[PDB]
């Protein structure tokens, strides 16, 4: 099974700034086993940053960065 299932990483530093989609790659929500809860955006170099789902701009990058259609 060459899929993905190791996104264990909470969040504790939200960045306020629209990342350049040219250097953006994807995103991911925090796991339920985390002391806190937040969203995460990732760049094309591997720099994954944390963010909050409340900020409208964030919900805009989450949907833009492919929809979380995980059934």
Strand order in the sheet with 39-43: 24-29, 39-43, 48-51
Dihedral angle of Cα 27, 6, 69, 42, to the nearest 10 degrees: 10
User: Taking every pair of C-alpha atoms in the chain, what is the biggest distance, in angstroms?
Assistant: 36
Solving technique: NMR
**Residues 43 and 19: beta-carbon distance below 8 Å:** yes
What one-character-per-residue DSSP string does 42-69 give? EESSS-EEEE-SSSHHHHHHHHHS----
**Residues 14 and 50: beta-carbon distance below 8 Å:** yes
In terms of CATH architecture, what is 1-71?
Answer: Beta Barrel (2.40)
Domain boundaries, the chain: 1-71
Q: Please state, in angstroms and rounded to a whole number, the distance separating the CA atoms of residues 24 and 42.
A: 6
């Amino acid at each position: 099974t060459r899929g993905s299932d190791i996104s264990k990483t909470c969040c504790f530093q939200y960045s306020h700034k629209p990342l350049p989609w040219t250097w953006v790659r994807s995103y991911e929500f925090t796991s339920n086993s985390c002391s806190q809860r937040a969203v995460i955006f990732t760049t094309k170099r591997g720099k994954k940053v944390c963010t909050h789902p409340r900020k409208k701009w964030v919900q805009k990058y989450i949907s833009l960065l492919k929809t979380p259609k995980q059934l």
